[PDB]
Amino acid sequence: QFTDVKCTGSKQCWPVCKQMFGKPNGKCMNGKCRCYS
Hints:
- The protein is built from 1 helix and 3 strands; from the N terminus they run βαββ.
- By secondary structure, the protein is an alpha+beta fold.
- It has a 3-stranded antiparallel β-sheet with strand order 1-3-2, with helices on one face.
- Strand 2 (27-29) and strand 3 (32-34) form a beta hairpin.
- Belongs to the short scorpion toxin superfamily. Potassium channel inhibitor family. Alpha-KTx 01 subfamily.
- It is found in: Secreted.
């Protein structure tokens, strides 16, 4: 899924997603994190 927090690339989005949802991977999109499956 998507997030509503500031990201600075996939790397920052990995822990951020891990925390929010629990999908330790993901990518960033012009400011917000994205998770994977």
